[PDB]
Amino acid sequence: LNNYLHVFYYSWYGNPQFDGKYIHWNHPVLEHWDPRIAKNYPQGRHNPPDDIGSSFYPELGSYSSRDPSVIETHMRQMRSASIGVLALSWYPPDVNDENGEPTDNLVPTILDKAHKYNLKVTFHIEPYSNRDDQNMYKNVKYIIDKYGNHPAFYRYKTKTGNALPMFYVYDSYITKPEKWANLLTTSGSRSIRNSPYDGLFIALLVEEKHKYDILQSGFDGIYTYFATNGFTYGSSHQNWASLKLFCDKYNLIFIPSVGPGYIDTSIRPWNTQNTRNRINGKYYEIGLSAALQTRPSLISITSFNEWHEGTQIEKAVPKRTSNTVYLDYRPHKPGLYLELTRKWSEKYSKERATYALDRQLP
Ligand SMILES: OC[C@H]1NC[C@@H](O)[C@@H](O[C@H]2O[C@H](CO)[C@@H](O)[C@H](O)[C@H]2O)[C@@H]1O
Ligand SMILES: [Mg+2]
């Protein structure tokens, strides 16, 4: 069970059975800002269970994240894949993504279940409205005060520092470095550094130039998230070597994000250019291979169950409707991407041993 391997996990799915309504599966088709194109594409909310906001279809179907048996299954599948850490998409309580309802109320159950399959839960901080250095302080405090004592709570166990929480911060670069440095530098007006609420803060890098913004901000590490090689400077794995090298110079944790392919045209029909075909695993493997080159401190996986963007490694089946031929992992099985992960996880987990300065040889 590899604890240096992280996977981005979403809890925002709902169905009538458990939530009393469909959530996220019944996703709207997001309109192009230019309506003179929006009108040449589908419109409105997907009407599940047959029609969902996804180019693939889950084994569990139109499932509820509030369904213990789903959480259980999910944990089990991550375990099969030998992932130790799920990076849970998080919004503050009474707050939600624009296409969902709130999901902090669920976290207690997700931890209990992560614990039950001896898995760990770190937090993937979404860009909630008015996110800044101030409410971030209030939320870190809430998160550790609320979930720190839970034996599922993830802490990067520094070989010989303190065991430190990790916070992945999605679209960090939105908040100016001056503002981050209030919270993330030692002498910042609201610094949690050297405090009971200190952690390892991970910033999304997009453009080459975000490097320097990230240093000025006070962040401990960087992650790329994006599954589409070519989309951003970060998500392009040819760049990854330079980001490792930079991260080494400035004592930053370089966490590359590897994805098994990309397709989001169920909800962003204009977004074809970033579609990547899975090539039955070849994409995913070239991604995980390029990540291992760098000899990274952790590796992140985009994603377990981002179904809208088609980055999910979770078990998916073939399905056909009156009008839709859903994609699927055929020729191979529902578990294909869990096995490709288990494979490369055990390879990473092993290779990572030879890295440490203490474990070198004559
Ligand atoms: O986890 C970070 C990032 N991942 C990809 C998306 O899930 C993105 O969320 C936006 O896009 C989804 C559709 O892809 C949409 O449901 C949501 O409301 C958006 O916030 C997310 O921030
Ligand atoms: Mg150290």
UniProtKB/Swiss-Prot annotation:
Membrane topology: Single-pass type II membrane protein
Keyword annotations of the record: Golgi apparatus, Hydrolase, Membrane, Signal-anchor, Transmembrane, Transmembrane helix
Catalysis: reaction(s): N-{alpha-Glc-(1->3)-alpha-Man-(1->2)-alpha-Man-(1->2)-alpha-Man-(1->3)-[alpha-Man-(1->2)-alpha-Man-(1->3)-[alpha-Man-(1->2)-alpha-Man-(1->6)]-alpha-Man-(1->6)]-beta-Man-(1->4)-beta-GlcNAc-(1->4)-beta-GlcNAc}-L-asparaginyl-[protein] + H2O = alpha-D-glucosyl-(1->3)-D-mannopyranose + N(4)-{alpha-D-Man-(1->2)-alpha-D-Man-(1->3)-[alpha-D-Man-(1->2)-alpha-D-Man-(1->3)-[alpha-D-Man-(1->2)-alpha-D-Man-(1->6)]-alpha-D-Man-(1->6)]-beta-D-Man-(1->4)-beta-D-GlaNAc-(1->4)-beta-D-GlcNAc}-L-asparaginyl-[protein] (N-glucan mannose isomer 8A1,2,3B1,2)
Tissues in which the protein is found: Highly expressed in the liver and kidney. Expressed at lower levels in muscle, pancreas, heart, placenta, lung and brain.
Compartments, record wording: Golgi apparatus membrane
GO molecular function, one term: alpha-mannosidase activity
Entry comment on modification after translation: Undergoes proteolytic cleavage in the C-terminal region.
Top-level EC class: hydrolase
GO CC terms in record: Golgi apparatus; Golgi membrane
pH dependence of this protein's activity: Optimum pH is 6.2.
Segments on the Lumenal side according to the record's topology features: 1-362
Temperature-dependent activity: Optimum temperature is 37 degrees Celsius.
Location of region: Catalytic: 1-362
EC number annotated for this UniProt entry: 3.2.1.130
Similarity annotation: Belongs to the glycosyl hydrolase 99 family.
Protein name: Glycoprotein endo-alpha-1,2-mannosidase
Taxonomic path: Eukaryota, Metazoa, Chordata, Craniata, Vertebrata
